[PDB]
Amino acid sequence: MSALTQILIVEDEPLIAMMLEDFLEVLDKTPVGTVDTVAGALARVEDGGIDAAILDVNLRGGEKSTPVAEALAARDIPFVFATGGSDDSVDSRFRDRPVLQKPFTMDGVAKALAALLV
Numbered sequence: 402m403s404a405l406t407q408i409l410i411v412e413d414e415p416l417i418a419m420m421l422e423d424f425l426e427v428l429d430k431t432p433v434g435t436v437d438t439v440a441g442a443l444a445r446v447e448d449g450g451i452d453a454a455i456l457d458v459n460l461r462g463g464e465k466s467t468p469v470a471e472a473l474a475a476r477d478i479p480f481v482f483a484t485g486g487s488d489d490s491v492d493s494r495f496r497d498r499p500v501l502q503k504p505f506t507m508d509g510v511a512k513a514l515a516a517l518l519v
Contacts, residue, residue, distance in 0.1 A: 402452045402477050405518045409442050409454035409478075410435040413461065417503065421455060424510045439469035446478050453517055455501070458484040458491060465491065481517055 408425065410432070412418040418435050425432040433451050436442050442454055454473060458465055473480050482495050485503030499516045502509065 402479065404452050406431045407433045407450065407452045408517070409433055409445055409451050411437075411439055411442050411454060411456045413437070413457055413459050417457075417505075420505050424505055428510065428514065430514070439467050439473070443469060443472055443476075446473060446476050451478055453478060454480045456480045456482060457503075458482050458495065459503075479517075481513075 408430065410418060410421045412421065412435065422432060422435065424430075434445050436445065439456060439460070442456070445451060456467075456470055460467055470480050481499045481501060482491065483501035483503065484490065488496070488500065491500075501513050501516075505513075
């Protein structure tokens with residue numbers, strides 16, 4: 402990490418993946434890619450050119466958690482959790498890291514980047 406202008410996207414549905422590409426182009430942000438799994442986000446960090454990422458908790462399989470996100474934190478490329486539901490559906494490790502709701506809007510995206518860039 403040397404800036405926070407470049408964010409990777411990880412999502413389980415193409416509908417929200419296209420919303421993340423839309424809000425990053427309206428806020429003059431520099432997006433760098435999108436993947437369906439965190440193992441693909443690690444393969445994109447092996448190529449560099451990334452500073453942070455967004456990650457959904459609604460991943461397939463497992464128990465609403467992933468150990469691969471911590472490998473991104475071990476490669477100095479931070480991440481953020483996102484989910485649709487109550488805030489009690491995740492462990493205290495998700496309550497210590499930044500969190501986001503599933504639907505995006507001009508007010509919620511301004512607070513999402515202010516929670517990442519700070």
